[PDB]
Amino acid sequence: DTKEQRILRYVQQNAKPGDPQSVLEAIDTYCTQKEWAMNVGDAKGQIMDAVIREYSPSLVLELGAYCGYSAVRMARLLQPGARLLTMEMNPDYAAITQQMLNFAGLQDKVTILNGASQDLIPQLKKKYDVDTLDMVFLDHWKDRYLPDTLLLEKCGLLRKGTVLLADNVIVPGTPDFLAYVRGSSSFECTHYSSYLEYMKVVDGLEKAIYQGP
Numbered sequence: 128d129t130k131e132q133r134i135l136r137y138v139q140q141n142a143k144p145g146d147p148q149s150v151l152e153a154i155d156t157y158c159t160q161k162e163w164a165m166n167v168g169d170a171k172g173q174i175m176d177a178v179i180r181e182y183s184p185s186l187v188l189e190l191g192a193y194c195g196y197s198a199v200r201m202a203r204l205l206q207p208g209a210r211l212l213t214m215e216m217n218p219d220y221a222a223i224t225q226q227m228l229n230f231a232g233l234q235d236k237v238t239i240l241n242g243a244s245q246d247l248i249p250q251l252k253k254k255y256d257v258d259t260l261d262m263v264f265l266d267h268w269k270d271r272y273l274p275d276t277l278l279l280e281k282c283g284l285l286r287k288g289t290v291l292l293a294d295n296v297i298v299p300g301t302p303d304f305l306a307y308v309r310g311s312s313s314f315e316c317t318h319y320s321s322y323l324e325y326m327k328v329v330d331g332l333e334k335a336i337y338q339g340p
């Protein structure tokens with residue numbers, strides 16, 4: 128089997144069904160004690176939680192679900208009726224994510240879209256009935272943060288106040304995205320310094336609030 132299958136099995140055998148917090152703790156324990164994996168982790172996850180609670184978004188888009196760790200983290204804090212759309216282009220990872228959400232009991236709040244951001248973002252309005260997004264969590268290929276931000280704008284998916292929250296802006300880094308949003312009058316940016324998941328290595332999240340064209 129794969130590392131992702133091992134993470135899922137570990138959750139299934141060490142967390143409580145329908146208890147998202149137990150799911151997060153099981154993933155973090157596995158990834159600390161057994162095998163590192165690119166989940167956002169608890170350090171940056173706590174900052175994510177604070178952001179989600181501040182904004183109480185009704186409709187969130189995630190780019191790059193992986194195993195569903197961040198999807199569980201966000202979805203467990205959403206208000207009744209609020210929704211997460213999470214994109215994962217790797218079909219094996221998309222299946223892990225679905226099963227993770229199912230175990231956590233969050234499947235009614237989340238729709239896992241198996242495809243690439245460049246193909247799916249232009250379909251969001253017509254195919255997934257989206258008007259505008261309240262928040263976007265960027266966690267996919269780091270060289271896609273900037274083009275997909277620009278694509279979301281082109282497609283009319285951002286409104287005044289839409290919160291972009293970007294993982295890994297330090298490691299592996301997203302220098303073009305950071306330079307762009309920090310220099311643009313269309314974004315109000317805040318950096319949240321933290322640590323790479325499961326490691327004593329500095330990383331951070333960037334929040335970039337869209338201000339309109």
Ligand SMILES: Nc1ncc2ncn(CCCCCNC(=O)c3cc(-c4ccc(F)cc4)cc(O)c3O)c2n1
Binds near residue numbers: 165268
């Ligand atoms: N276009 C499109 N559309 C949709 C999609 N769905 C999935 N993908 C592709 C996602 C591929 C994984 C992206 N994430 C990372 O590479 C990542 C890496 C590290 C890391 C690694 C090694 C180190 F030594 C240190 C840090 C840490 C992180 O937290 C990361 O998130 C998509 N792409």
Ligand SMILES: [Cl-]
Binds near residue numbers: 166167168196
């Ligand atoms: Cl994650």
Ligand SMILES: [Cl-]
Binds near residue numbers: 169170171326
């Ligand atoms: Cl961590």
Ligand SMILES: [Mg+2]
Binds near residue numbers: 167266295
């Ligand atoms: Mg990441």
